[PDB]
Ligand binder design. Structure first.
Ligand SMILES: NS(=O)(=O)c1ccccc1OC(F)F
Ligand SMILES: NS(=O)(=O)c1ccccc1OC(F)F
Lengths: 263, 264
């Protein structure tokens, strides 16, 4: 991949692999979300990084607060998908990373995503607003004018998600992460939580519908030795409300919604 | 990727991804085994397929009986790895698929693998010898002279694996596959079983050693709604382990294997 002409966004092409596709011989949403993460990392590498000089001295990291993916067409096995990604400052709240997924043959937009990121101290895990010093450093890598993947004011990407109330309609209990679910820093990958959310959707929905929209709020990380319960309730196309919580005390780790279309 | 000049082997280059690497910033053995599977599939596609005309008419499929991976150097995140793969007939027993992993910059061999495949009826799950009619159809895609990734007289790839006896030294109880662990035909991916085997190795071994050799025998398939227990016992400067995968309930064997680890 490479940075675009203006050096304010990064493009990369991926060939869809045999093991990355589902029953429909098209890429799963977890494969897509893994590709978005990879193109995000390559953009950080190409511009010099993933934290700023001041962030390293202050022991601060970027953590995901929310992920919103919208797919119109999942790429088939062997197809080439092209993803363009960019970052933008959101004042002192944090940073937003957006993506556009395109068909490499037609050039049509097949999907789009947006994510919200906040600053946190590696140790202590305290949320802190973005400093004036750590702002000047990365603003040179972001476009100055707003460039939104979801320009619609008050759309699905910015809707507040409610808490699922017991009893849930569907459930998947006792989910545990394995070594492959960890990243290079031995933390659970943000993509595993997507897989866990979807585990409680009935197989009959998965077989008869396609995932169109997925919005996921991150509240607490799942440790290597933690166990998770995945809960789902229909709120409706098919709409669902999801809750990820610890098998024991029931401490919330994630909340979200999914929208599915009949095939 | 592309087939080589003679049309008897397939080469492909992969850039190592951020999510594909472990704590050491090098590709995990599950990422490697996934790449071997992908290059295997692209070889089947390039030559016209992953079953022959006769195999589809008789509802027969190719199933893995054994996998043997040996890694000298795991590629780093961002490095380009090049894999060459080929198939060879083993008479009526079945087919063997071999791989060579190379560093794309130096051209040095960083790893190698071999796997044994048998014919099975997709519906009855009954195994069978390869008929001559099937053998004539795919022999045109295989080299005629033997081309072994593991030439050695006394090689690790062909050693019989014993059954782990209880009590195991280490264990990882209640492992269940999730949707991402399934392939396009809703069967558990052969690579997930590698991850499950390794789950019972203590984290202290993983942190202080590197996986050099892994041999895994496939006996039974894990269904979507099956639960697995992963057992490990040390059998040994190097560390050797004996592994057993079995169903949490009745204890029906699904896999058996060995791993060899060296100090970092
Ligand atoms: N290092 S990074 O991944 O956070 C990054 C990459 C490209 C542009 C900006 C940016 O950081 C900004 F959000 F602070
Ligand atoms: N089994 S397969 O269809 O994946 C295949 C791929 C390339 C060459 C031969 C071949 O068949 C036979 F050698 F087993």
């Amino acid at each position: 991949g490479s940075l675009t002409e203006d050096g304010l966004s990064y493009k990369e092409k991926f060939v869809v692999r045999s093991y990355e596709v589902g029953s429909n011989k098209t890429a799963t949403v977890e494969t897509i979300a893994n590709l978005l993460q990879e193109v995000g990392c390559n953009h950080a590498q190409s511009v010099g990084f993933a934290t700023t000089t001041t962030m390293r001295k202050l022991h601060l990291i970027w953590v995901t607060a929310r992920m919103h993916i919208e797919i119109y067409k999942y790429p088939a096995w062997g197809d080439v998908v092209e993803i363009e990604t960019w970052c933008q400052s959101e004042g002192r709240i944090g940073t937003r990373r957006d993506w556009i997924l395109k068909d490499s043959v037609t050039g049509e937009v097949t999907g789009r995503a947006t994510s919200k990121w906040v600053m946190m101290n590696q140790d202590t895990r305290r949320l802190q607003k973005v400093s004036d010093d750590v702002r000047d450093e990365y603003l040179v890598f972001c476009p100055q004018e707003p460039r939104l993947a979801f320009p619609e004011e008050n759309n699905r990407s910015l809707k507040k998600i409610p808490k699922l109330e017991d009893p849930a309609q569907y459930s998947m209990i006792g989910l545990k992460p394995r070594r492959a679910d960890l990243d290079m820093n031995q933390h659970v990958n943000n993509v595993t939580y997507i897989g866990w959310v979807l585990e409680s959707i009935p197989q009959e929905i998965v077989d008869t519908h396609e995932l169109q929209v997925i919005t996921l709020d991150y509240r607490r990380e799942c440790q290597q030795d933690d166990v998770v319960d995945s809960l789902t309730t229909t709120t409706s196309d098919s709409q669902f409300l999801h809750l990820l919580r610890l098998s024991g005390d029931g401490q919330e780790i994630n909340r979200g919604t999914t929208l599915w279309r009949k095939k």
